[PDB]
Ligand binder design. Structure first.
Ligand SMILES: [Cl-]
Ligand SMILES: [Cl-]
Lengths: 118, 117, 117, 118, 117, 117
């Protein structure tokens, strides 16, 4: 019954996407997805991960905290990459509160992100 | 549309009309002048940001609050407090450490009693 | 008043005079150009921010640090590190998640030695 | 109007105590007291701090987290001490979940704590 | 008094009578034998700890849960889940990292639907 | 199978063979006496726990580490440090707050050099 992120493998990148039921990511939603998300952070070096935020309209500290956990798992790979795409303008305003995303390249669409991460 | 500034119980109270449910860069610029003017009274300055009705904001609004707070914080006995912060707003404020030194109250009635001096 | 830039054990060390107990936007603006000028050394560039005596900073200092870090990280063999960061300042770095981006050491001698590995 | 911890100076130790209204320390109570608590962590080296938990019947992660913030502020003093006393049996069961209190000496009463910390 | 073990929808459900509002060392020893016996069924084992009515526990109970979980976790497709966890219990469980891999559900009805296989 | 104890640059280094990918209560019991025997060196005692290759541990390993730390910390000049700790394991240490008790380094060479300061 319980909704979850969807994890796809596209062009050597593990892509994390969100179903429509996850418009707003609070503490409850973050607990629901944490396990699938963190298990998707493994893979042969260099690991490349893209968080595709299309459809997501809100998040805050709980979700940023999860993303940081994912990033810490892959960040020691020399050519590892932890990227975002399709971030709504509001979610960008929330990201602007934190400084950590300065190390996560952000792209306007998945297609652009995938091409840049080849 | 602008914020509503009132003087209640020695406290300058900043409130938001319903139109400001979402506070993006545009809204922050609409209200910055009246907001910052409310930071300029007799010292020690006590300020209450009553966020009832406000459901979303980001860096723009936080930066305005911080700016107002830096005016008030000259005053050793000054207070810059928040009340009626919605759970969405809490989730955003938690992204930064800067707001921890602003006392939190559940409601305006509670804040004004707590802040009486 | 400005940052002190010294060269120790092949590391460019940035230190803060006593007057910078608090690094606010004002102080960050005073030191910005010397700081960024310090990021242009011979390769691989090793940089240590010795925060001894600094008791407060916030968002604008972090933004400056992130810039400098971005100039250094181009080096592959380069290191950008912090030491002697106060308990309050460590919290700021942890709450915004920027703490695990860079190595952080308790003391300068620990750092200078660690950074020779 | 708002209840707060009480901070006393006793025999060169900063003693933090709790009013009866704080039987149960959740997230809300921890926010109420954080500011007074953290401001009480300053003082000439060596700083000695005692958290007197008499009357407190419950706490969990939020309060332990605050205590850790206090402890980090004083822990670099070579003869610094961050101690607890008068911890109810239940609160000891909760402390047993965490490992950090293995570095905080615990004493059965304030009088005993103060004598040991001279 | 003992825990109540039932088999609902392929799931072994552990429930607590009202007398177990507080779970201290004594209570954990009262229930350990019936609890651990419920960890021994056909594989993959699915277990639900329905904590409705339970208001306080500490290390003793957490250690019992962990012990039961280590029996179940042999099973690659095994599940050890919690539901109806009170806010006091959440505050205690947050003190340790070990419980994060136990899924959480708000109610038993929700858990049993989620866990159906 | 047991821990490997080596002496490097005046530091007693504890390492784990490949088979200890997971340090549970069982593995913790196998290594406990060698580990504690390793804590009795010449003063000041410097000890490094090289956790390279360990992907999981929990409460009983932390308890062992805390014991060893308590034997070393008697030295005043002594150091007890960790390195090469996996991301999961760092979380365990942070959630129980034991991470800032000890220095933790990214690599062994970083640690051995840092610990000469
Ligand atoms: Cl796929
Ligand atoms: Cl006093």
């Amino acid at each position: 019954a319980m909704a979850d992120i969807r994890v796809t493998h596209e062009a050597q990148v593990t892509v994390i996407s969100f179903p429509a039921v996850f418009q707003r990511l609070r503490e409850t939603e973050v607990e629901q997805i944490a396990s699938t998300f963190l298990a998707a952070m493994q893979g042969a070096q260099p690991r490349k991960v893209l968080i595709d935020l299309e459809g997501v309209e809100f998040f805050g500290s709980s979700f940023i905290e999860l993303l940081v956990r994912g990033w810490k798992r892959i960040k020691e790979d020399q050519q590892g990459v932890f990227a975002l795409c399709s971030v709504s303008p509001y979610c960008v305003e929330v990201l602007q509160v934190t400084h950590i995303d300065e190390v996560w390249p952000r792209y306007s669409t998945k297609q652009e992100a995938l091409l840049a991460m080849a």
